[PDB]
C-alpha cells in the first residue's frame, strides 16, 4: 500500500464499522451473534478484502466510504429484490 495522507483520517473504528455493515448487507443477520458464527470468518474475510480494496482505491476516507456505500447499497437491494420479487 502506498502512503496516502488521508489514511490517518480514518481509524480502525470507522473502517471496521463499515466492514461490519458490509457483512450486515451481504448477510441479513437475525442477531448480532450470527456475526460471530462460522459464516462470519468468511463474510468478514469478504468484507475485509472488499474494504481494503476500496480503502486503497480511494483518495479520501469519505470517498472510500462513498464508493463502498455504493457497492453495499446495490448488493442490498440486489439480494432483496431477487429473492423477494423477481423469482
Amino acid at each position: 500500500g502506498v502512503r496516502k495522507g488521508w489514511h490517518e483520517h480514518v481509524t480502525q473504528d470507522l473502517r471496521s464499522h463499515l466492514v461490519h455493515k458490509l457483512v450486515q448487507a451481504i448477510f441479513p443477520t437475525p442477531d448480532p451473534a450470527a456475526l460471530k458464527d462460522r459464516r462470519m470468518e468468511n463474510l468478514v474475510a469478504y468484507a475485509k478484502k472488499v474494504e481494503g480494496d476500496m480503502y486503497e482505491s480511494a483518495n479520501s476516507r469519505d470517498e472510500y466510504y462513498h464508493l463502498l456505500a455504493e457497492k453495499i447499497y446495490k448488493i442490498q437491494k440486489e439480494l432483496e429484490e431477487k429473492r423477494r420479487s423477481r423469482l
Binding site: 473504528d13 470507522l14 471496521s16 464499522h17 463499515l18 461490519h20 455493515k21 450486515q24 451481504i26 448477510f27 441479513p28 443477520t29 437475525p30 442477531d31 448480532p32 451473534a33 450470527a34 456475526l35 468468511n42 463474510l43 474475510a45 469478504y46 478484502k49 472488499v50 480494496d53 470517498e63 466510504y65 462513498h66 464508493l67 463502498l68 456505500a69 455504493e70 457497492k71 453495499i72 447499497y73 442490498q76 440486489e78 439480494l79 431477487k82 429473492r83 423469482l87
Partner: protein, 52 residues
C-alpha cells in the same frame, strides 16, 4: 462514490448515522425471519469472496 441512481441517500444517511454519529456499533442485527435468505446471492458471493 458512484451513484448512477441518485437515490443513495437512504444508505449514505444510514452509514452517516451508524458509523459517524453513533461511531461504534459492531453488534447489530435485525433479520426478522432469519438470515439465510441470500441463497442464490451466495453464488455470486462465492465468486466475490474467492479472490482478494
Amino acid at each position: 462514490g458512484s451513484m448512477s441512481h441518485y437515490g443513495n441517500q437512504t444508505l449514505q444517511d444510514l452509514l452517516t448515522s451508524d458509523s459517524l454519529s453513533h461511531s461504534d456499533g459492531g453488534g447489530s442485527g435485525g433479520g426478522s425471519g432469519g438470515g439465510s435468505l441470500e441463497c442464490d446471492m451466495e453464488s455470486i458471493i462465492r465468486s466475490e469472496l474467492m479472490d482478494a
